[PDB]
Amino acid sequence: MFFRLTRELRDELKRPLGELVRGPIPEPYLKVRGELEKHPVVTVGDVVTENVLKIGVKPIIALYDLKTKRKEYSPEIEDTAVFLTVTNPPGTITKALLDTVRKAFGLAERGRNVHILVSGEEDLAAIPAVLYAPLGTLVLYGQPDEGVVLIKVTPECKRRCAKILASMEVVR
């Protein structure tokens, strides 16, 4: 079972799902660093994860490409984080991804940070990240050639991400 982007969604998802923080790396991360200090953070993408680590913030969940040459190595993270993997083809949200993200939030509830190494494309994981996150969680993803998108997980935002999912094609 997987969901697939419709043409409407593919177009419309080019628009930020939160406020867009601009400027050359690492300036966007500096600019949100204060927000990240309060709230739990989920990072989607290797570059986002790397730059969040670099400014001294540990994501509760980080999603990035299985084939990432991993940067900002922290011994603490290597030893303390749970490493999961999942296959998720471009333009899809697979059940496997939904299940893995839910698992991950479970682990996070119990004081464990989680890295999900995705075979395929992790981009759309921002959707399940929002849906399953504790209220007040921040979800960050990269908007190429523009900067970083910050989603604050509110009831309203969950509602709207649920609509995005409900608007995708169901396949098998």
Q: Tell me whether residue 79 is annotated as binding.
A: no
User: Which is it for strands 2-4 and 82-88: parallel, antiparallel or unpaired?
Assistant: unpaired
Q: Tell me whether residue 122 is annotated as binding.
A: yes
Q: Tell me whether residue 11 is annotated as binding.
A: no
- Whether the link from the prior residue into 28 is cis, omega within 30° of 0, is no
Look up residue 92 and give its two tokens: 């899809």
Q: Tell me whether residue 118 is annotated as binding.
A: no
d(CA 5, CA 90): 9
Taking CA atoms, 55 is separated from 46, 52, 144, in Å, by 15, 6, 20
Q: Tell me whether residue 67 is annotated as binding.
A: yes
C-beta separation of 52 from 35 below 8 A: no
Residues annotated in a binding site: 23, 29, 46-48, 65, 67, 122, 145
Residues annotated in a binding site for GTP: 23, 29, 46-48, 65, 67, 122, 145
